[PDB]
Tab-separated table of N, CA and C in Angstrom:
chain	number	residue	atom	x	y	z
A	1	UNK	N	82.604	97.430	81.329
A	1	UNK	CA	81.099	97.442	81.280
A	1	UNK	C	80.596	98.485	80.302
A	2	UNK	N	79.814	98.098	79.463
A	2	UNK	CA	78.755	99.192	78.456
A	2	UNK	C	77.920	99.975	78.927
A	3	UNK	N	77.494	100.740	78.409
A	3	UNK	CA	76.148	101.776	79.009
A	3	UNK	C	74.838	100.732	79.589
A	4	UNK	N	74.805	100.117	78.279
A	4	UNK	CA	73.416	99.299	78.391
A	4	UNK	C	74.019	98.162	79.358
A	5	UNK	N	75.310	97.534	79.584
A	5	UNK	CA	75.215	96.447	80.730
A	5	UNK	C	75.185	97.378	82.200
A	6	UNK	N	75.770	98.914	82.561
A	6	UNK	CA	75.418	99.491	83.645
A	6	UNK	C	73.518	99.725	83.799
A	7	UNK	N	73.474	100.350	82.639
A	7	UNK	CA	71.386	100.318	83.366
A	7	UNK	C	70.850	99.138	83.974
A	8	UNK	N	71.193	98.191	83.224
A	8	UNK	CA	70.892	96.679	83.329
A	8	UNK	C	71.040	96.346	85.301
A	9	UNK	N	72.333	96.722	85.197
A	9	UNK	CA	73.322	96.212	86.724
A	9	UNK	C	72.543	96.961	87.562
A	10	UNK	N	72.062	98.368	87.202
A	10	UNK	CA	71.210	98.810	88.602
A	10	UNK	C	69.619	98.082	89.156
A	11	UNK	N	68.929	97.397	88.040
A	11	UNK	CA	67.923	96.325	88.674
A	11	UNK	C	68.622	95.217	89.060
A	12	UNK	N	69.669	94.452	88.787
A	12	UNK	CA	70.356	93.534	89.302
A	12	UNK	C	70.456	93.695	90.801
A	13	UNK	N	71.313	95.075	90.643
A	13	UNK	CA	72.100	95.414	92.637
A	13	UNK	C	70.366	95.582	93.100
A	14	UNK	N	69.838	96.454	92.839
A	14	UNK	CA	68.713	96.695	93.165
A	14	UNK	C	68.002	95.415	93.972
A	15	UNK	N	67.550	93.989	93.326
A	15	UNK	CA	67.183	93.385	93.598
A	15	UNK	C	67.436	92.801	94.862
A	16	UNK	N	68.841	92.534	95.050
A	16	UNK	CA	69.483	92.278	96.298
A	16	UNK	C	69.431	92.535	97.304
A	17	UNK	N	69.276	94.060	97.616
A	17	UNK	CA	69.386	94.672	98.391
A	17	UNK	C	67.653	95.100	98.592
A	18	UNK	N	66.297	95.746	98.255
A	18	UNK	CA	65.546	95.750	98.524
A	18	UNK	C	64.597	94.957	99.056
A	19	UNK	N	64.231	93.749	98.857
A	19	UNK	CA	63.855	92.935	99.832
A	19	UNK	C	64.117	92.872	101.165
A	20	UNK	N	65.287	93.206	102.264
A	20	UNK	CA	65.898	93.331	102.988
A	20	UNK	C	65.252	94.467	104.059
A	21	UNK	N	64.234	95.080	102.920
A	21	UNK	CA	63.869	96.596	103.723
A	21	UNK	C	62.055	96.616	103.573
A	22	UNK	N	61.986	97.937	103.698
A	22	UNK	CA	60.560	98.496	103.832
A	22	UNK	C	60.491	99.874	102.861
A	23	UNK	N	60.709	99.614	102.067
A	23	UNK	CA	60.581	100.601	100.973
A	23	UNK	C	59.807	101.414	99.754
A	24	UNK	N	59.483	102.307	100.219
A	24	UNK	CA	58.730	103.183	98.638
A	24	UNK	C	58.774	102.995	97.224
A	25	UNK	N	58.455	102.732	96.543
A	25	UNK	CA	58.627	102.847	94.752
A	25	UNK	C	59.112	104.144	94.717
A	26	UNK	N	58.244	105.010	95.203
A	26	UNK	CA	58.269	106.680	94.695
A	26	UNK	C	59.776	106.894	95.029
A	27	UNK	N	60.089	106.223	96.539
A	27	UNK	CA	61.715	106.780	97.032
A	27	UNK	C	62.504	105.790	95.902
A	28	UNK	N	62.150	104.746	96.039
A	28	UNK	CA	63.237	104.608	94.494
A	28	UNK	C	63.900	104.578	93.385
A	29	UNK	N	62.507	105.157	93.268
A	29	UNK	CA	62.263	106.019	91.419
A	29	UNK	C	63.034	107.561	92.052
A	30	UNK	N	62.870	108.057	92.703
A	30	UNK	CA	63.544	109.351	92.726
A	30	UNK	C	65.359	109.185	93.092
A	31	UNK	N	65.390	107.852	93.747
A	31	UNK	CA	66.781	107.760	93.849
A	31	UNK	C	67.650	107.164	92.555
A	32	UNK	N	66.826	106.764	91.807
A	32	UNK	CA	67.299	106.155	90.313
A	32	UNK	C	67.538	106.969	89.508
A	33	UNK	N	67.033	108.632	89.583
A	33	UNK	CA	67.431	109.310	88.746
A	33	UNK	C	68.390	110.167	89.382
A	34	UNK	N	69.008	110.146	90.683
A	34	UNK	CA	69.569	111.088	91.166
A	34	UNK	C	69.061	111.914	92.171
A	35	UNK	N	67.722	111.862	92.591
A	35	UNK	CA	66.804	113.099	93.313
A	35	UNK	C	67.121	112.523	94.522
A	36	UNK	N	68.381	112.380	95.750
A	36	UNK	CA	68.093	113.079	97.010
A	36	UNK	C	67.392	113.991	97.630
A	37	UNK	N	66.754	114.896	96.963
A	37	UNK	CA	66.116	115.962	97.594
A	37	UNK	C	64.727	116.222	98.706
A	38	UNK	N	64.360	114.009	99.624
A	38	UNK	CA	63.783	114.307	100.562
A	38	UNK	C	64.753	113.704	101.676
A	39	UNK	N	63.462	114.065	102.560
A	39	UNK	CA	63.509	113.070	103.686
A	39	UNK	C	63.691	112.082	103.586
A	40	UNK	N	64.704	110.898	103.934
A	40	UNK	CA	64.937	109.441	103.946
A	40	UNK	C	64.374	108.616	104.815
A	41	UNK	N	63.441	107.894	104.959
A	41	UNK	CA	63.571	106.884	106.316
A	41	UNK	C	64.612	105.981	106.423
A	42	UNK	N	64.708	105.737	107.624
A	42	UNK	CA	65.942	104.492	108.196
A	42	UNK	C	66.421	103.795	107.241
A	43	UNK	N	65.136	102.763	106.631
A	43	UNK	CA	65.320	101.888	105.846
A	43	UNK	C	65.623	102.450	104.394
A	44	UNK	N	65.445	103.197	104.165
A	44	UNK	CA	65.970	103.767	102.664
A	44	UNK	C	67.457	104.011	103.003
A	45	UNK	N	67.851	104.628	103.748
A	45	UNK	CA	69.136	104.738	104.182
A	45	UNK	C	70.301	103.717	103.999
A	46	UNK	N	69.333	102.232	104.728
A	46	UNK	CA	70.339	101.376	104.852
A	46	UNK	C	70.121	100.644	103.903
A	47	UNK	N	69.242	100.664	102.959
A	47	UNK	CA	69.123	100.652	101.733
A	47	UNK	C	70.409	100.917	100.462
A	48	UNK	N	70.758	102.453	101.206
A	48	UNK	CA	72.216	102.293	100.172
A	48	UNK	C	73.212	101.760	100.507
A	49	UNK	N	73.531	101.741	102.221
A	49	UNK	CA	74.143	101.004	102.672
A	49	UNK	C	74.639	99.813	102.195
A	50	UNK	N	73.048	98.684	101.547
A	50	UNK	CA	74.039	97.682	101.323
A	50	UNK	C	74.015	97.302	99.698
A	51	UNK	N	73.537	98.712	99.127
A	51	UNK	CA	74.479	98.668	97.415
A	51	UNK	C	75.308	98.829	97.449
A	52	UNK	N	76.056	99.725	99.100
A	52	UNK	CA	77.334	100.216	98.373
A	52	UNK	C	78.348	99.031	99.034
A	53	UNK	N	77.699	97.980	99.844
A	53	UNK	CA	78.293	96.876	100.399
A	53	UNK	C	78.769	96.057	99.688
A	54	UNK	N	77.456	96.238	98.482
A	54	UNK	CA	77.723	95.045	97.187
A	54	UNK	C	78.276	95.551	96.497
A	55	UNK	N	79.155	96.959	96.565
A	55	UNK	CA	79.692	97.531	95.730
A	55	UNK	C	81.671	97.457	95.838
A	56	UNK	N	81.410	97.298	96.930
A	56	UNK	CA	83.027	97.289	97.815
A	56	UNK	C	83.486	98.702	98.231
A	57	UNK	N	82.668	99.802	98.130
A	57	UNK	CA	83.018	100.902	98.341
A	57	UNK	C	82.623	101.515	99.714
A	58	UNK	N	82.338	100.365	100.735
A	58	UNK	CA	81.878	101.107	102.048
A	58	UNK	C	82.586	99.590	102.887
A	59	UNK	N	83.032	100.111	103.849
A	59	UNK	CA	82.783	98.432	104.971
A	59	UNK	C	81.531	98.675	105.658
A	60	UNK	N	81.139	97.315	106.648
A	60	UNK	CA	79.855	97.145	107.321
A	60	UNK	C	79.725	98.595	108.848
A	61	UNK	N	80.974	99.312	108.804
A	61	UNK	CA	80.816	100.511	109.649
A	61	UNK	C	80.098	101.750	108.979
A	62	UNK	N	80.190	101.606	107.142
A	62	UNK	CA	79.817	102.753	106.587
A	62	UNK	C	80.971	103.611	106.322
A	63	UNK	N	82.106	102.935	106.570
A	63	UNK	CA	83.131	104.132	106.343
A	63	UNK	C	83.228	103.923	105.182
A	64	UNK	N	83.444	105.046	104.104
A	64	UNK	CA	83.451	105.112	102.910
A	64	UNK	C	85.247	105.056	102.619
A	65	UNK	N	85.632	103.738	100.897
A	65	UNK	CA	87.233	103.816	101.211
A	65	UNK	C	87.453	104.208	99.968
A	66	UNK	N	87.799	106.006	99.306
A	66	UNK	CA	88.553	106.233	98.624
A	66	UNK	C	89.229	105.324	97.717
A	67	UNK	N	90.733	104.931	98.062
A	67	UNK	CA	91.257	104.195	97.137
A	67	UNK	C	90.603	102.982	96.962
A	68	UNK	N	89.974	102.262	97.276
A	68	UNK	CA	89.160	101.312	97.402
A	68	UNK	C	88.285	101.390	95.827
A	69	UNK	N	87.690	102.614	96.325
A	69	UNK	CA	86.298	102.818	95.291
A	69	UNK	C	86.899	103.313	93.904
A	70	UNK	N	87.866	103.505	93.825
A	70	UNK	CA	89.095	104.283	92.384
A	70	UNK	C	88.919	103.224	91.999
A	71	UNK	N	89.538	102.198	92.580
A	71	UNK	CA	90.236	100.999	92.277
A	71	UNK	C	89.010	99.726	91.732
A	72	UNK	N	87.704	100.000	92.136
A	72	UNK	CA	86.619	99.491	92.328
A	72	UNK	C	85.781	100.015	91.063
A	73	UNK	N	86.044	101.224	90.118
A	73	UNK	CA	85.240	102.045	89.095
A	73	UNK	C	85.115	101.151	87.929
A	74	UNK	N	85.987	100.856	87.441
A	74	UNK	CA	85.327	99.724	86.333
A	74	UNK	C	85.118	98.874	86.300
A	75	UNK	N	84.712	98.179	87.608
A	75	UNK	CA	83.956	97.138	87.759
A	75	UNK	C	82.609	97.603	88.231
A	76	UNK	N	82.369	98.988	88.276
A	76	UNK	CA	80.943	99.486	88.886
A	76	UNK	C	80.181	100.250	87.716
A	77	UNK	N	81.241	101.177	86.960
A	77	UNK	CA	80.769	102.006	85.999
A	77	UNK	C	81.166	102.236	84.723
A	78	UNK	N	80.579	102.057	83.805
A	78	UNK	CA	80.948	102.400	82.233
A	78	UNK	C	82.089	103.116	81.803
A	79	UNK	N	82.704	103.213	80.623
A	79	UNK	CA	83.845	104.801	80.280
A	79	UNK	C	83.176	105.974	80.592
A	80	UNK	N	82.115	105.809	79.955
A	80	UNK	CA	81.737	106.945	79.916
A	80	UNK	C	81.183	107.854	81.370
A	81	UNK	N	81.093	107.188	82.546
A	81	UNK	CA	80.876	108.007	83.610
A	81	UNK	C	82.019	107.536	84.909
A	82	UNK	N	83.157	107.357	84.141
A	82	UNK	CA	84.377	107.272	84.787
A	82	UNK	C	84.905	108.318	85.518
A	83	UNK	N	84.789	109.534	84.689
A	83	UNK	CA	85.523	110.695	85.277
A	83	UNK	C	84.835	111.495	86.199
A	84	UNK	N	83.722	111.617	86.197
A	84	UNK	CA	82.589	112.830	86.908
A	84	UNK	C	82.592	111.398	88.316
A	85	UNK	N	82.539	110.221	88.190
A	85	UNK	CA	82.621	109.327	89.243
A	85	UNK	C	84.190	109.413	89.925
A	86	UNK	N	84.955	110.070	89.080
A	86	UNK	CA	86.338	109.456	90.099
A	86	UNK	C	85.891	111.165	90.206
A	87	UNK	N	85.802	112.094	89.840
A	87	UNK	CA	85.529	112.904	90.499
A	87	UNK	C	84.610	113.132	92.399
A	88	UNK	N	83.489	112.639	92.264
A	88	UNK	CA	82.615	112.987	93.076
A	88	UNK	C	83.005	111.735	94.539
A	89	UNK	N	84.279	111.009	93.632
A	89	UNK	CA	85.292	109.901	94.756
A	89	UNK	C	85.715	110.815	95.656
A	90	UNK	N	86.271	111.728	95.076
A	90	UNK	CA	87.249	112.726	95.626
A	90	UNK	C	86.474	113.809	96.280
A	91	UNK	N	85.577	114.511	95.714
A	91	UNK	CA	84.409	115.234	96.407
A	91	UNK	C	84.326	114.943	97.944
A	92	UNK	N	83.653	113.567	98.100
A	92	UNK	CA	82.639	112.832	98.448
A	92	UNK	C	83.982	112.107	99.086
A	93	UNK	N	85.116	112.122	99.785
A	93	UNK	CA	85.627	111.226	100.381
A	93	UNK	C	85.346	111.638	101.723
A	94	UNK	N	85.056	112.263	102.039
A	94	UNK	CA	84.940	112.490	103.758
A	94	UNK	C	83.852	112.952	104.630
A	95	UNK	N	82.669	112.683	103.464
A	95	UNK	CA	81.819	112.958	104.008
A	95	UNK	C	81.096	111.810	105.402
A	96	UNK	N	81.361	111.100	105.484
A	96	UNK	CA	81.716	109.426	106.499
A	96	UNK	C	81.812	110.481	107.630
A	97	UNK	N	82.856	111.232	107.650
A	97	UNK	CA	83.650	111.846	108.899
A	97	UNK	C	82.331	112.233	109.687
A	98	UNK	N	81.230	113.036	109.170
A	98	UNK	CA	80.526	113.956	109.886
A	98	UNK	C	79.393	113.253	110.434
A	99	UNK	N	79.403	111.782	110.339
A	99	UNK	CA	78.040	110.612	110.797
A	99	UNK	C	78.877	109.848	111.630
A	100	UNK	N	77.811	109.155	112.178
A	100	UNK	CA	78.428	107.898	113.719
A	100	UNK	C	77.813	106.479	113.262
A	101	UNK	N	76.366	106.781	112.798
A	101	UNK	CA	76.119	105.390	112.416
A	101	UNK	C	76.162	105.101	110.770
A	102	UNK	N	76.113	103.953	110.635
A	102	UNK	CA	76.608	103.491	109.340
A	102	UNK	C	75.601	104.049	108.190
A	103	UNK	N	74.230	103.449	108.256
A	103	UNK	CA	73.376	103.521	107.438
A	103	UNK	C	73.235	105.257	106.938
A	104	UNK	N	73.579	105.615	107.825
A	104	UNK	CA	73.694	107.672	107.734
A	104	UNK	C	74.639	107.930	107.323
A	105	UNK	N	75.846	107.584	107.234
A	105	UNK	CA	77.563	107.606	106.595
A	105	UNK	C	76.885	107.317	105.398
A	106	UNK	N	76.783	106.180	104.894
A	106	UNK	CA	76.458	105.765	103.606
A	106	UNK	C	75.700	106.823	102.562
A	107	UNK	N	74.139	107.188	103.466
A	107	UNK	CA	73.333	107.619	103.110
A	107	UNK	C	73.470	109.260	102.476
A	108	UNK	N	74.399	109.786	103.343
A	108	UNK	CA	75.116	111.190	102.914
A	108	UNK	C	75.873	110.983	101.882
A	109	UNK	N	77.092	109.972	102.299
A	109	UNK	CA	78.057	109.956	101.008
A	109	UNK	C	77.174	109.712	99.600
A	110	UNK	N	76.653	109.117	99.361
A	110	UNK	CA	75.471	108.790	98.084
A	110	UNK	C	74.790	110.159	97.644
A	111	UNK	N	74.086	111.041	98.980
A	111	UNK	CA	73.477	112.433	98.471
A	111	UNK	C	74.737	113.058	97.646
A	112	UNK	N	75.608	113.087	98.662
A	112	UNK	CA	77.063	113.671	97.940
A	112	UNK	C	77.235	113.531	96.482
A	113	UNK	N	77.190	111.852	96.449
A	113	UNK	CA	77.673	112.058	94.931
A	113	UNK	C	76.622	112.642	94.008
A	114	UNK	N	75.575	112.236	94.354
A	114	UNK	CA	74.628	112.919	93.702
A	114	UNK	C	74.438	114.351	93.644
A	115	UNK	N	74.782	115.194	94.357
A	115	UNK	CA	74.715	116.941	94.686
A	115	UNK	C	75.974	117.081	93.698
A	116	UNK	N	77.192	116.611	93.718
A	116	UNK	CA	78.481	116.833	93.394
A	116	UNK	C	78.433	116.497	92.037
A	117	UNK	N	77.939	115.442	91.551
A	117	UNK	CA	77.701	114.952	90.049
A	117	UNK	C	77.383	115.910	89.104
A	118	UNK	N	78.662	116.166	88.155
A	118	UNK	CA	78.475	116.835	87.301
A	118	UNK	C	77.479	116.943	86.092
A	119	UNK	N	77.105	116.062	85.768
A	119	UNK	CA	76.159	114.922	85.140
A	119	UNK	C	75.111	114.286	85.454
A	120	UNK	N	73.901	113.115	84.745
A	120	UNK	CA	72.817	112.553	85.261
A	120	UNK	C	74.318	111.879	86.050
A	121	UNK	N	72.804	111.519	87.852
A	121	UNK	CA	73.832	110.302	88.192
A	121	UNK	C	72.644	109.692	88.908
A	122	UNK	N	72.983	107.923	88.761
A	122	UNK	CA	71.745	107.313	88.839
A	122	UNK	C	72.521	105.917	89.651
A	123	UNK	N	71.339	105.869	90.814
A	123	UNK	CA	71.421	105.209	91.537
A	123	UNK	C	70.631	103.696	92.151
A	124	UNK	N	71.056	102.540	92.007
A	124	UNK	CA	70.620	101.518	92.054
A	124	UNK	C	68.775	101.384	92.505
């Protein structure tokens, strides 16, 4: 995948998955550039939940799967944000452990990569 076919792919996943919910512009514009930095409601939550469903990098429990998501990177992300991503894989593998329900597993692991991201990191 190219730079310009990943920007592209995040209104694609995007599409899929928002209808499904009850959602802000403002919360999605801040999650597109990376800004975790509020409060989430439910539905924003499970919101990432099921990008990262359409992503193959979570099952429907929210457990987040490491080798899974390695194995899963260039079919999700460009060369160029290969490494700071298999990075924040590794970061960001266990953060699952410290949640019970799914949409909150998800929802952390995602802040994660985003806090951990060495780099812009931008989200569906």
């Amino acid at each position: 995948m190219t730079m310009e076919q990943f920007l592209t792919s995040l209104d694609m996943i995007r599409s899929g998955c928002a209808p499904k919910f009850k959602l802000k512009t403002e919360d999605l514009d801040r999650l597109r550039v990376g800004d975790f930095n509020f409060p989430p409601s439910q539905d924003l939550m499970c919101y990432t939940k099921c990008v990262s469903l359409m992503a193959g990098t979570v099952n429907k429990k929210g457990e987040f799967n490491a080798p899974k998501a390695l194995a899963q990177l260039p079919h999700l992300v460009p060369p160029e944000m290969m490494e700071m991503s298999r990075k924040s894989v590794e970061a960001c593998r266990d953060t699952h452990k410290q949640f019970k329900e799914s949409c909150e597993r998800v929802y952390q692991t995602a802040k994660c990569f985003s806090e951990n991201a060495d780099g812009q990191f931008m989200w569906p």
